[PDB]
Design a binder for this molecule. Structure first.
Ligand code: FDE
Ligand SMILES: Oc1ccc(Br)cc1
Length: 137
């Protein structure tokens, strides 16, 4: 289930991070506006960009840590607040997290693997709720 999915994703975190994040940017093209120099790039051009690989892996590592400290797909309120208060990232919004998790769930459902896609959908809605409660716009 969910805990095993954290283990699967981490075992190839760079590749899963990139492919899920590309699914997200392709499903919601306006999301590239928030990232310097992503606009007008193909998937392969983005993969060439040092900060794309580095930043996307750091996004997914943080989401795997929050996921790992969650109970029944409910993250720690204290993790939501540390996220809202992260240096730089003042412009983060819950809607863009709504969309990242929609993309993640559709990726898992299309995978040939026994990901607990319903648990990640729950976790997404619970992280969004928690970020909102913690004062994210
Ligand atoms: C969702 C999310 C999550 C996250 C996470 C993270 C971690 C763990 C870490 C990090 C980092 C970072 N960011 Fe991060 N993140 C995000 C997002 C983001 C955005 C939108 C931005 C902006 C970009 C530009 O264009 O500027 C960022 C941003 C960012 C930054 C800036 C600078 C560079 O390098 O490029 C940094 C450093 N981020 N990060
Ligand atoms: O505002 C946001 C932009 C990108 C992500 Br991923 C999450 C929030």
């Amino acid at each position: 289930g969910f805990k095993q999915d954290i283990a699967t994703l981490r075992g190839d975190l760079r590749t899963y991070a990139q492919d899920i994040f590309l699914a997200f940017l392709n499903k919601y093209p306006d999301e590239k506006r928030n990232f310097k120099n992503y606009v007008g790039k193909s998937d392969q051009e983005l993969k060439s960009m040092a900060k794309f690989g580095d930043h996307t892996e750091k996004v997914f590592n943080l989401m795997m840590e929050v996921a790992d400290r969650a109970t029944d797909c409910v993250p720690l309120a204290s993790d939501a607040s540390t996220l809202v208060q992260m240096k730089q990232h003042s412009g983060l919004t819950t809607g863009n997290f709504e969309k990242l998790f929609v993309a993640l769930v559709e990726y898992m459902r299309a995978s040939g693997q026994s990901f607990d896609s319903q648990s990640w959908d729950r976790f997404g809605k619970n992280l969004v709720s928690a970020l909102s409660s913690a004062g994210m716009k």
